[PDB]
Amino acid sequence: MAIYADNSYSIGNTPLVRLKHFGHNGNVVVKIEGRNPSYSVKCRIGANMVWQAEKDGTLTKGKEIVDATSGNTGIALAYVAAARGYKITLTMPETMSLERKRLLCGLGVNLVLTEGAKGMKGAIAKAEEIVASDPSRYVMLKQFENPANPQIHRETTGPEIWKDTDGKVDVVVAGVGTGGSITGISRAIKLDFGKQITSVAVEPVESPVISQTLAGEEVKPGPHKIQGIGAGFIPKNLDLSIIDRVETVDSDTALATARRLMAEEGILAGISSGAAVAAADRLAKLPEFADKLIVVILPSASERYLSTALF
Amino acid sequence: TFEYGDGI
16 A cells, blocks of 8 residues: 555655756756655654664664754654654753754753753753663664764665656765765665766855865864854765765855745755755766756755744 | 864
């Protein structure tokens, strides 16, 4: 038939929409990862990191999920925990938007707010304390280094892009947070489908640690408003070997592009979706990419950024 | 003003 046993199995199969006010002669095509169980790309890894943990016995009945995240990964793990019957504790600074806090409370996760001045480090700290108090009961999924992260993109997101474009995709543009998306997609298309595309990583110009690293320059991260990317470091789940190009975008332009997506394309896209498009638009208007079909990842949806500068 | 890790 086509009936999913729980909500975690309904992930993926996100659509491709062709942009009309970006690129040149419709060479920019976006992938709407907002059309997911919890309305973000993270739904794929929230599912697979849990499925994998079960498969190798690290996650069993009675066990409890504890992790640190202040983005869509928390919402992704939350719905999967609920759908599959796991208790879950998520740690994050008390600096979080009340909107997302109530959303998580609606999903039945134990909220642990760490000190604001501590930030994420304090969040990871508390989460690691909790696990340490009962290492037999608690399990941390660790999105940045868990191989289950980019693996699911190699098995789903990548093949979806390949099938929908009939293998005519020449470029993939994606922001980097955990790096799992670009890694899995690139690995899928370059190795499993054997086509030598151009993988483009997008990062904030405010915190361009990938551009700085590849050039041997001094790594100097910084604050930005492009939620979802710009971790300030190189994640283990970012495979540099498959990265062909690194584009940088500023927050202000990324915001503007996201507004343009709504008012002009009729696409409810997130902030990082604007950054990814703004970068692809730049490439698309290069005569070297005029022939090339450019597929862009739109990680999330607008209504998640209601209380932000997006509106 | 997302920085070291958040979020993600």
